[model samples]
Every structure is written in structure tokens, then in C-alpha cells.
Target: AELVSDKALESAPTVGWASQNGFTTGGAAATSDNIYIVTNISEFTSALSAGAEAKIIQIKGTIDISGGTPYTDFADQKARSQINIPANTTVIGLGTDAKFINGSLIIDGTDGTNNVIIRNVYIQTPIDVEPHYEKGDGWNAEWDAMNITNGAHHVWIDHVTISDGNFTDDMYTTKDGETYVQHDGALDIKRGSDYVTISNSLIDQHDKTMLIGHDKGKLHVTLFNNVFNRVTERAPRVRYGSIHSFNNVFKGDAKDPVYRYQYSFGIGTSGSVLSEGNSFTIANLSASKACKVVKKFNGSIFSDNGSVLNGSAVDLSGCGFSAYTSKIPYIYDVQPMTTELAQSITDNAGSGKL
Candidate 1:
């Protein structure tokens, strides 16, 4: 059968209503084998909270919960936003044009969290400049764009874009003085959420993107073919589990700002981590004096097949080296430089300007 559309939703039945007070749809148990098309932002947020066993959900509208509408602050509203996914439910966006705007989707897996998949959705958060003090707080005042808890597994975030929209500054802060400003990861696998695959997505956080393994049993998470751009710290700050990051792109945009540490990939855990076929590119690698690449954690067998490591270390086979021919500092300290340089030389050689 054809997927449900907005026009079909208006005339079909009174299953749900998308209003200013927020969208409210039937619970998952209320409808079986049905599709819900959300054209309203408020309505979409509400339906997500009401819970649904949606066979397929297509979101095609603008959700501006950025305090430009009736709501003052989207983040405040999201603080109260709830998400419930029933068994065998798959949420998919029609295409890139179909977006779910404003506020993050906080999944409160209070109702027996199991078998939930969120795919092809554009989830964004407003950039907050005001600083607050807290421990381990990233860019914004929050942790992740999409927070999945309560044993929510089999989750797949694919072909989606999750960003904080603030590239130049920090995103959030905490009471204990921990800060996270940029590229708050698409998925924060906290409280032991396992078997998740975050692939083919674009994540640009000022800080580390895709933080997995806050709890136990958070294993077998695969991040493949995703582009992590402009990250400040590590791309995927993996703590535990067997993470296979292959064919991914990691870019850092740190220039010589007079005060900032050089950029590099960091691996918290060493064992069971596989870094293969991924590309790392950095702007002003010669000028900013930023370490192009370096890998200094532990226990991971690093392999390089056509990877690029620019900035320095020329004549290092399996490692691409770009001599800072210009009047730049030519800093080179990127982690896992061999693989990063190899990928860069193979992928970005024709560009002719690193």
C-alpha cells in the first residue's frame, strides 16, 4: 500500500490533531498497521509523546520550536517533550525536504522500551550563547539532540542530519564546569542501549559527536559512512563496546586562534574498536599549527588503506603528507595520522589546497 500523506490524513479519520498546544495522536495500542503523516510541528511532538506503534511515519513540515512562535523556547518545551515508541514501529522521513524542526526528541522509555527505529529525520536544536556552569555539559545546556534511554535497542539513525547550528562557539555548560558546545552527537546511547547503527548521517557538533557507552551492555554499535564535520574534540567518543567506524569522514575546522589546543581523534577505550576506511580533513593544517592527526589511546589495531595524513611527515608510505609550502606553521599531531593522512591524500588530493 502507498504511504500515508497529509491530504489523506485530513479526511481519513480523527486519529490525531496537530494544534498550537502541540500535536496529539492516538497511542501505539490505538492503531495497528497504520501510518501517520505529520505536517505540523506541535502535533508531531505530541504524537511522539502519546506513543504509537506506527508501521511508518512520514514527517513533511516545518517545526519551528525555536521560540519564534507561540512557544517561547523550544528547548524548554522539549524539556517537557516526551517520546514513546512501541514495538515494531519504524519512523521514516519522506526525503531531505521533510524535516522535524526545533527541540530534540527525548525518548522516555518508560513504557517497556523495545524495538524502536528512528530514521531519515532532520533533528535540530537552537544555539544557546548564555553560559551556565555544570559538570560534563557540552555546547548547549543539554547532552544530545536525541536522547534514547530505558533499554531502547535496535535503533537505527540513518541518512539524517543532527546539528546544534552553532559552529563558532560552545554549545552548553554544566554545574561542574564540563562543557559541550558543538555537534552534540545524533545519538547518545545511555543506560545500556545496544545494537544501534548510526550510519549515513551528517553530524557536526562543536564537541564530540555520537557518544556511545555510558552504561553497560552498550555494545555492537556500528557507525559507517557518516560525515562528522567541524568537531572540537573526538568524533565518536566511544567509551566501551565493539565499535566499527568504517568509511566515515571526520573534519576539524580549527585555525590558529591564538588560544586552542590542536585537533585530533581520541579513543577512550582501546579494545574492540576498529578504525578503517575513514577520511580526516582539516582546514589551515599548515597555518593553524594544529596537529593534523594522531591516535594515542590503546588496544585498537589501526589499519590504513589509501588513507591521508596531511600537515607533516612526508615520505611516510600509507601516510599522505602535505608539506606546508605556504608561510604556515605546518603543525602535525593528528591522532592515527597514518590512516587519516592516507585517506586525505587519496580523497582530497585533486583539491590542491589543504
Candidate 2:
């Protein structure tokens, strides 16, 4: 048991027998123990209130705790600044510049959930002074930077960087001002979390970024290659089973009069949501006469496949959707370097420049 550095206790871990340089505890009992906790951000609410069931829970720095309130409206201050994962846990972020700013680290499955692996951290959510209880009980008065509710399963919100500045207002006027017409979504996967997998992240702002179904036998979720910036209105409102959206990149640049609505990456009620190779770029709004009447009730399969709309340079007018047209012309271009330059043999190959 000899490993020390000390930056207030560097990389904390000195074998077993209940450790705590920063935190570490290995097993022999207590159901084959293997706990490891490393912290920063003022020791993350007392290392997650010392809930040490740890199987590698790392969060090495940057936590502001946003003093203006808004850490998702104090459910005992998010159960004491959350970090309760006890079921095959594997939280990693010792590198990737380690971040946990502002405050929102909830992974509370209430001691019964399974298979959790949150990679490379950077979660933010702290803006609302007061403006989220909109009477429908969908609770988003302002802050929900990252929430994976009860019955959480196979959860993996990879390469994290969840943001929130709160901007979705048709006419939300609380604080006794009393107004209505609202919708806010920035990663709010409701109760009954099932097989979730939100890959390669970088989700910006607030207002419908992803509110996939409100628990109805939720199944096999997959949202790939993410990158949604300046989102104004609807980005993802999927509400049903089997949502497997691929290569996503939805951009927006807000214009004031509240007109950035492009919802329906597969919205409510009907099951089986599979939007293939997705891509939608609405540079400064206007391309929504109804967006082909909401893409025929949200059964999307639209594609332009430039490796799934790589840098989409807009011109998808009227939006009936059909540019996935291909006779295999630039199908991922240059087949294996033209089959290795037609089986190589370029002259002057005797150890010289071919």
C-alpha cells in the first residue's frame, strides 16, 4: 500500500481496508467490493455524501454548484448533489480534461438499476432563476442539464458535454407574471429508462434537444454522432419504442419571433421510431411550410448520406424528403484506394520513391 502524490491527495488510492486519500476501497466482502472515488469541485458534495459503493467513480475537478440556485430545483438539492450509482458501475473521466462544472451529476437508480457507464465528463445546467413549473407535470422550470430517471438500464451517455442556457419561450411568464405557451427540452429522458445509448456528444442550449418518450415500455435507444448547436425550438420529441436515430446534426440560429420549429425526429404515440442517417440544417429559419406536413406523421428515413449529412449545406426545400438518391457514384468514394492501386507494382520500387 504505497502510492502518493498529494494535490490535496493526488489520485487517491492506497489499496484496501477502507481507503480515502481522495477515495478507494477494494473488495473481499460486501459483495466482492471494488470502490474507487476521486474528486474535485470541492470534493463533490463530500464525495457524493460518502455513498461509496464505488466501482471506479471519477470526477476530477470543476464544479461551480451554481450559487444562483437552479441545480434542477433541489430534490434535497438533487439528493445532495447526486452520485449514487450502485450496480455494475463504471464512471470514467479522469482524463479528457476532467470536468463537472455548474452541477448536475444525477445517476440515482435508487440502488436497483444496472449497467451504468458515463464516460468523459462535462455536464452543465444552471440558468433559471425561476420559470419551469408549467402545470403539465413534465417538470422543467429551468434546469435539467442531465437526468436519467428511475429504472435506469444499460445507461451510457458517452463523451459528455450537456449544456443549458434556457431559451424556449412562446410566452412563459411565471414569478407571478402568469403567462403560458411553453416547451423546454434539453436531455430529459423520462421514467422507465431502457437500454439508453447517447453517443459522441456535444448538445447545446435548451428547448427540445431530446425528450424521448415519457415511459411506455421504452426500448433499445440509440442516438449517434451527435452535434446540435444553437437549438431554438424542437429538435427531438420522440415518444415511443425502438428509436434508432443515426448520424445526427441539427443546427439553428434563432431570430426572436420564436420561429425555429423543426420537431419530429419521431414524435409520440406510435411505436417503432427509426430515423436513418439524419441531417437537417435550417440556417436562420424559413424552411417549414409544414415541413411536408411534419414528415408524414414522423416516420422518418430521410437521408442525403454524405457520411450522413457531414456538413449539410442546406437546400432541402418543402421537405417531402428524397435526396438519398444514389446509384453508388461517390459511395464513400475511392474503394479501398482503388483496391490498393490495382494490386500495386509501381515501377522504381526497389526501395526508392515509387
Candidate 3:
């Protein structure tokens, strides 16, 4: 097929880790005939089934994959609930009304899938009907709004919004005299996924917002210009990756009744993190306690430069400095975290903001 240029792909910003390495050009070299506009789950799935030939898919309106499939038919539901994104594709929502409910958008390296882009979409993760149980933890939920795993690389997720959705009340299941969480990570990148970036997105009221490394090989990820709003934990819990988190704002209010402020950055198992020019504002929390948000889980190597907490400069750069040494290869501009910048991020970091 003769390839033509796509305005969406041509205008899409190539930044962060995705711009490093060899770079990502999702659906940029696609033919005009390969472009599709889908309005429902059936059409959505059909459009994506078009194979590995560089396609652009535009989603419109609210598409629900929640109904039809019985909860007892776990295999079918799992199949429907996880939408596999093919490589060399660009999945962008048409506008502000574009929403996907009760499904997970997955891009894995089963066939060495690479160079995918998902932008300007709102995703409400599916509810686990047949939830996985853990003893102390209670109910452990499977699936995520977006799961980039199994060595899928050069993926960009920008200007997207992810939340617990209408199932917020169903987030708990009691078993064995204990309560467990039924919601999982909103966006997870693991199993050797490399050269990925998640920028200018909003993660609102989700538990364990991101898990950067599960079983890692060489995970090089960049998260910038994102807003973490009242999320419980793991704004990203990382392992065995050189993670760069910058120009982001993490805001939480302790009196919010539902959301609790755990640590934001969880460094575990040989993870190297650099957190720069970010803002953290937690009401009713002291600067000393709030500034110490870097939680270590047998992990070492972190550099915190030019980050502010509760209107004061805080540096935990020495938190894991003694364990390892790494350098970032890409050059980018950094805006110092400020009250205005944080406000702007809060006002603009969700879907359709691009």
C-alpha cells in the first residue's frame, strides 16, 4: 500500500522517552484509505483488526464494552474487556465526548508490537465481576485502563484521562475476615516495555495509578506534565527502570474522606528514578512528612532536583544516590514547579486538552 501523511500523526508531539532511542511514528506512514472512524465497540474492534499496516483509528462518542458478555463467562469477558492494540497504530479520540468504558486497552509484545500512540481519550476501567482474592489484601483486581507490557516499546499515551469510573463503590470485597481492593493500576507498563512516555494526562481518584516495572529487562520510561489527583498510591511504583518524572503536579487533600495520601514514588528492586521540577501540595500534611514521599522497597538510586512541596524546596536526591549511577540521554526543557504551573496543570491535563 502506498503510504500517505496523516495530520494527526504528523502533528503529534514526539517527546519524552518515546523520542529517545529510535523514536516513534505511529500511523504517520499510513495510507488515507487505512484511516477509520469508529462509533461503537464492534466497529472499534473491527477497525483495529485491520492488521499491522500502519492505520489510524478515530474513536467517537461513548463506547461501552461492559454489557452483553456475562460475568460468569470469564474467558469471553476477559477477551472483550482487553482490547489488543496493534503496532504502528494511532488511536485517538475524536473529541471531548470520546470515552471508553469497561475495557482495557492493551499493547503487548507478543508479536514484538511497537510504535503505538493513544491520545485524548477518557477511559473508565472495567469492573471485576469475578475478582481475584488475596488474604490480607482482600480483592485484587485484574486489568487496567491501559496495559503496555511484554516488551512493547515506543508507546506514547498523552492527554488522556483515567479514573475508577462508576465502579468506585465496588472497589472492595470482603473475604477471610479482611477487606481487599478491587481496583487495580490505571496504566501499567511492565515486562520489559521500553521507550515509552505518558505525558499531559490526568489520573484521578485511582488506586495504584501506575506500575512501571513488574518483571523488568530494560524499562526506560518518561512521565511528564501529568496530574495525579487524589490517587491513593503508586503514582507509580517502579522497579528495575530508569524512570524520569518531571513537570508534574501531585495534589491531595487529607480531609477528602475517601482518598488517603500514601507515598507517591515507590522505588523498588533496582529502579533508578529522577524526579525533577515537580510540585506536591497536600493539605493538612506537614512539609517534612509530605516531602518524604519517596518510598523505597529494596530499591536504590533516585535523584530529586528542583521539586517543591507545600511551597518549599525539598530535595531527597540523596535518598538512593549511594546505590547506583545513571544518566538521561535526551535533552528537554524543564519549567520550575510553581503555583501557577500547578494550577495550569490542574486546569489542563485531561482528555481533549490537546
Candidate 4:
């Protein structure tokens, strides 16, 4: 429709499926794209490992890989146990009941990747059940979740949910260190991953949450209209990149706060993050402060415009400079969000229901 064109330019995909592999280049997926239905983990892996250029892999049942299978290594090359996602594929869950538990999906480009889309998949804990089992090196605790690193280009993570509960860590419970982290992160898009979009998802009660960029590489991402519900920190800790973050809601509760939830949108390395039109609802705040947006580095610049903290003005102190440089490639829709609207996100965000 006309609305679509108004938000994205011709450089972005306008029809069919959008696929990308390199920097600032994407195209429409052909109509002849293959479709693969996956109900089990083995079939899931086989389809994922394929060298297909464009394919749609649908999940009908639950794909539980929390145990017995963990292939992808750590970002720092520390530990084991992860599910690797092949490049150049679209992974969709068949229904709201479809789940992926106990495994991490790496956009590791080992099999190949140019563009990939992951939607409607509720990723939770599985093999992480051995929370007390001690996975060795502290980094090993992060083995149980998704990682988009090592130059995974052109990725989109939309309408997904990553939370802690069930096989994940117990909520409001102080972590017992690495031995009991249960889940490391909901999502981490870093290590040269570029042209990525993370939108309309639910990330709840995760200590590490989302981490984007590092000390190296170009990271230009769009975080549009997402909901950070009760997530403590790193609602993405941005590093090196030009990030466009807007039209999202960040909610925090301290009725029973953890040792976490210090701040949201903490930036460290030299990069750019443009935050606009976002909303926050912070309750019972403290040293474990939430709803506070921070720019942790003086080299990186941050711009906050049209955003509301709801309780107090977002504390911006001793961090970085106020700035803006247009690095976003596409336009997106954004209406101001309120606490009620943000609260309703859990019912709709994440995978399965879509």
C-alpha cells in the first residue's frame, strides 16, 4: 500500500520477500522460493544446514534442542551447546503454540547467509534445565540462547518472545552465579552483523537481554516498535554502530526487584544511537533503577527526542553527548505508546500467535 512505500524506500524490499547478505544491499525473494515444514529437531537442523538461497521453513510442533544437541560455539569461543541457523532462510512458527526451547539460534554464516527472517517463534529454555549443573567457564551460561554474530548480515527478528520462566531462570530470584543463570540472553546481534531490524517482540525478565555491536565492525540496525517488558538491562547495550531506536515501550517494576534492572539502553563504545518516540513506565525505582536511559561512553553520541519516561524525566548524566546523524536506511511506523499499550504487548508480541 501507499503507507508501506512511505516508510521504506525502493532500496528496501517492497514486494515478495526481502533478502540481504551484504552491507546495505537487499532484494525481493523470488516466488519460486521453496517451503519446508519442520516438526522435529533433526528435520529442522537438516533444512537449516541446507545451502538454499531462499526458503521458508515452518515449524508445526515444538523444536526442543535444549539438550543432546548444541553445536554453535560462543562469541568469545568459550563453550558449547547451540542450534545454528543457516543463512538465507525464513524461519516461521506455524502457530502460537509452536515453541523453540533449550537451544540457541546462531546466524553464524558457517552454512552461509545473505538474508534470513525469524518470526513468531517463542524461544525458551530446554537443556538449561540443569541450571545447577555448572556449565564451566562463566561464558558457558550464555550457550543456551540466540547469537547473531560473526558478520551475519541482513537479518530480521520480529514478533518473537524471549523470556525467563519454565526451563529459564526463576523470576525475582537472585541468580546463583553462572551455575544458575539458566538463560544467558534473549538475543545478541553483534560482531559485524549489519542492516538488521528487531521489531515488535517481547523480552521479559532477562538479565542480559539484547546486546548489539562490539569493539569492532559496522553495525547499523533499526529497533522499531518493540516492547521491553520488565527486562533489567541491555535492553540492548549498544557498542559500535549507527542504531535507530524508536516507537518502543520500556516497562519496569520493582515490587520485587532483582540485583539487576540498573538501566536501559546503555551505550559503551564509540557509535551512534538515535532514540525517538519511546515510552517508559517505571515503578518503585532505586539503585536497581529502571526507565533510566544512559549513554555510557563519551565517544558515542545519543539523541533522545519525543520520548517520555512517565514518572520522571529520564536521567541522562555523565554518559555522552546529545547528537543525531541520519544513518537509518528505511522509514517505519510509530505511534506513541502508553503503559496500557505496553502491558498488552505480551499477549501479542513474540512467536506462535502470529
Candidate 5:
């Protein structure tokens, strides 16, 4: 066993919603005795589960929870790989090589868990060895890269990358003459979670990227300075949340004929979103069509301020809808929307960039 380095794990000041409204300071008070450096699944799980009195768990290398088992049922696989992080914990990666493959990191709300921070890690979702049948949609998989559910609060996920990692065609099964995808949301903040922020992250090569608020309840979340790459829809689809998204970039893949990129935001029932100073770049999409990427899914409240699409200023209010807006309670600076800002976000938004 190696000794824990003094600079192996450190907590930084959080921004966005997590910076205010309860003010998340995860494991900042963890003493040297409470710092754990883990390199494997057993060490990782034990370190995280060790009495949760402000602990700092540092991930060092790739940890695979699959255990080289061929899992057919999604629930069984999920049960094995889903790691539930407790309250007042800081789970961070040592460097870019720190990764969790075929697993999920969850902050459970049922336990009243709060003030959790995850930073500078790579999460590759589990490929369902046997996916559940979905009638017309072929088959769908389960498990999110990270889940903040059941009323967990004051959580910040920064400088992380979540994706469907390096999958081959045979990993997917074909039913009804269509390929079934074995991935779910990269990040989901739902089931009554509040004061959560996802910043400076890269969500790549996924269809359902982020789903916020599946049920109707009071939820507050913030997303800023992240890159959504090759995502089809739901860069975040919300139900009932005061969601603020700003300074984010959404990129679509027009090269793929099948599953052409869809909307970035889906405003569902009772969800209120204020998207400010964001950029959207999609191939062959006109300014008019790109401005209207905020799809109306029966959600009434939506507003866009100082956002751009393909280098053209877009007034989302003119997307055949009135410009109804909501205010972010916290005070944060919104970077001006520009093509150069978008490039900077893409360059510095993932793990190892920090």
C-alpha cells in the first residue's frame, strides 16, 4: 500500500447553485487521517463507505466493477456497479488516468445525503449485456454515470467526463431489425434534488445526456461551462425544476444520417429554464432552426438571454413563443457568448484539464 500524498485530494470553491443556497463545501475539513487513496474497486468502495465524517477519497487508476462477469439482467449488473456515495464526501481523481468503467456514482437522496463533490474523473457507463425490450425503440439500457436523486442537495460535479466508452458493434444486440443501445443518461439530477451544479465537464457520445426532474417537485439545479458533444436530445430535459444553464456549448453530429441531433433542452411540465450566454453549433442547421432548439414539451416557462447559434445572435423569444423568464437567485457572472468562448469550453471542459 502506498501512503496518501498531501496534495492528492483537495477541494476547491464551488460556483453556480452549489456555491450558494446551503453552500456546498464537501470534505474541505477532512484531516490527513480521513484521506484515502484507492486504486481498485474494493479499495474504492471501502474508502467511500468508511465512516462518513468528511472524508476525501482519491481515485488513482481504472476500476472496473464488472468483475469480468457476463451479466444478463440490468438490475443485477446495476446493483454490482452502482456506488452510493455518502454525505459530506469529496471523491476526486488523482489525474486524467483515474476512471470508473462499467459503473455509476450515485448520491442517494433517501439517506438525506448532502454536500457531496465529485471532480476530475472519467466515468464510462455499463453496457447492458442483456437490455430490456422496449417494443418500438428496440431495447434500452439502464444506469447513469452519476445520479443525484431522492432529494440530495448541495452537490457539485466539475471537470468530469461521462460517455459510452469504446463500445463495439457486437456489444449491442439487434432486435426488430434495429440496433439497441446499452446506455442511459450520462448525468441525471432528479427525484427532488436541489442546489446542484454541473460545471466544466464533457458529456460525449451519448443520446440521452442529462435528465433533470423526472417527477414533479421543487428542484433547483445549475449547469455552466460544460460541453455537450454528439448528443441527440435532452442536453437536459426537465420536469419541475428552476434550472439555470449558461455558458455551455451544444454540438450535434450531422454526419450521422440516422439519429440526427435533436433539441438541446426539453422544457417539460412546470419546468422553468433560463439559458443565458450559451452557444449551439450544429451542421447544416440554419440560424432560425438552431435558435428554436429549446423544444416545448408542455413546459410553459423558458427564456434565453444572449445566446448564439452558429455565430449568429438568436432571440429564442422569436421561436413563435413569448419570452417568459425566471431569475437565478445566486449572483454569478455570465461570460459573453462568442465563438471563441465555445472553443475555450471545448478545450478545457473535461477531466485532466484541471
Candidate 6:
């Protein structure tokens, strides 16, 4: 009787996953069936391969694959360091400190594997030490921290932290004394992958941050509410796909200015990038122009839904308007964020705090 209208009633929170773009009810954290525990690399490998089809794994401690602590030698089993995840699986970390060092995870289709979820884990410093750079199971030796490749669909990755700085070794003196490609990538989602979501994660200090459809194919992805810290470029450089990016934070590298700056979001090669409700923090005063929204290399479709930058006055007002980025198809409903994004992002983005 006291309520003015039926529309004023508060809506009840649904007892299900929070719209992982397009995923099942269990977006990695619903009622899971089977569970496994992993502490080391061998156990991690075994547990991934040997589990129920509908299963969840708990990573308890730090997984060190390097020959030594923090960093792994190039000569030590780098080719044998990657693990593959089968279908219908979920892997989660224990706490803020649950991490993976000097290795990679391949969420590829092994035996028709699909419907996967990875959460609350830290992937760090996977070296590109795989000699010969062989390609197997549609995966090359680029040494990505996580390779969601080969059409792995219906995947959700949330609250994960991936940085390319934790497991670095001394500069090796080559025959010509050159240093290059310590780690090839952080996250590479390519080769016909679709209906995936990467949310509430932090990717820090990597040369190549995220790549969606590097060579072109159907790649539908949702990158929501994440943080990009000091990544040089490719905070998801795209090619031939529909990408939904919203409510994320892109903070350039203030420490090593060369490794940062420039446009955070890039469009390329027949790609469509729909962005909204995000924040872009400039690396510093000189890189103040880093707040520009979108850059099109070979891209065609793009939409800028407007996000705040440098904390005041809608900094994306005069940002970027390319003639090549006007052909958009079905832009999603952009939610208007009335607050500055950095505080909420830092409060709730990455793993340890998740």
C-alpha cells in the first residue's frame, strides 16, 4: 500500500551466473560436480587430464615450472611445460597467492572439449623457450600464458591475473648477444573461437597483451570489467570478429614508458570492436594523449560508447573518429556508468582479491 507503483519494487537477484555473454548457468561458479586439487605442475597436468567431464579443480599453491624459483632456465623442459584442458571443466585458484609460474595452459579441443571456466589464478612469466617453435594440436610455440585456441567455445575466464614479469631470468649472452621475446604472450584467443568471456581479470606488464583472431575467423568474445596494466599494445588487438568490451580499465606503463603508451584498443582486419563504460588512465603527463579511444589498422567496424579518462570531464570527447570504423552491426545496450571506473576496478578486478 505504501509503494507508489509496481515499477518501484526492487528486483530480486537471480540465483544463477551473471550473464557471461552467452554461457551455461554455471559460469565456472555454480553448483559444480566433481572437484580436484593441484599443487605442482605434474599434479596439475594429471588432474586436468584425469577428471570428470563436469568437474572443477582447486589450485592450492604456487606452481613453479621454472628450473629455479621465480624464473625458469631456457634449457629446462619448456617444451613440456604446457598442459591441456579437456571439455566441461572448471579450474579455480585457492586465494590471492595461487599462481602459475613459467608455464602455459592450452584450453584447446582435445576430445570435443568445450564449456570451460578458469578463475582466480595468476599466470606469470611463461617463457618462449620452446625450441624449434613447433606447431601441434593447432598450437604453436609462442608461449602464451593461456592459449584459448582452436575454436574452444563457451568459455569463461574471470578474476584471473596474468603478468609477464614475475618469472624472468638474467639476460642470456647469445652468439650475437641479443635479448628478445622473453614471453611471447599473455592471452591469445584465436582460430575460430566464439562465445567466450574474459572478465574481472588483470593483465599486467606483457609485451603482447590479448589477441582476438590473429589470423581471422569467427571469434565472438566479451571482455568485461577487466584491467590492463602496462601492456605495450594488443589490449586485445582484433581481427575479424564481434568483440564486446565494457567497464574495463586500461592503465599504461608509467614505469617503463616505452613499453606503454599509444592506443590501448586497436581494430584490425575486418574486426568489429564495440566498447563502452571503460576507463583509460594515462601513463603520465607526456603520454597524456594515451586516452584516445580506438585505432584502426586494417579494421572496418567500430563503435565508441564513451568512457571516462584521467578522472574528469568526459576525456573521450575529442578522442578518435576514423572513417574506417563506422560500419557497426548490432551494437549492444551500453550501460551508462555514472562513476569514475578506477576505484571500482582496482577494488574488484584481479585474482588475489577475488
Candidates in order have lDDT scores of 0.48, 0.46, 0.79, 0.61, 0.79, 0.65
RMSD of each: 12.1, 19.6, 2.8, 6.3, 2.4, 8.1
lDDT of 4 by residue, 1-354 (tens): 011111111122321112223432222241343456777777787766555455567776678663345443343223334666765567767656667765677787554455767777788743343333344544235453678887777777777777765743444233445434545667887777776777777786677777777545467677766778777777777878767777777777645345244567766677667777777766665533422566365446777766666644454433446576654444455555555655565456666545
Candidate 4 local lDDT, residue 55: 54
Q: How close is candidate 4 to the true structure, as a TM-score?
A: 0.77
Candidate 6 deviant stretches above 4 angstroms = 1-22, 25-33, 66-78, 130-141, 167-177, 215-217, 253-255, 284-293, 313-340
The model with the greater lDDT, 2 or 4, is 4
- Rank candidates by TM-score, best first: 5, 3, 6, 4, 1, 2
Against the hidden reference, what TM-scores do the models get? 0.64, 0.27, 0.92, 0.77, 0.92, 0.78
Backbone steric clashes in candidate 6, count: 1
- State how far residue 228 of model 5 sits from its true place (Å): 0.5
Worst 10 residues of 3 by lDDT: 1-10
Report the lDDT of model 3 for residue 165.
67
**Can you write out model 6's per-residue Cα lDDT over 111-136, one digit (the tens) per residue?**
55567777888888576554332233
RMSD of 4: 6.3
Instruction: State model 4's lDDT.
Output: 0.61
Error of 1 at 321 (Å): 22
> Which residue pairs collide, candidate 5?
none
Q: After aligning candidate 6 to the native by TM-score, how far in Å is the CA of 61 from where it should be?
A: 0.9
Error of 4 at 117 (Å): 0.4
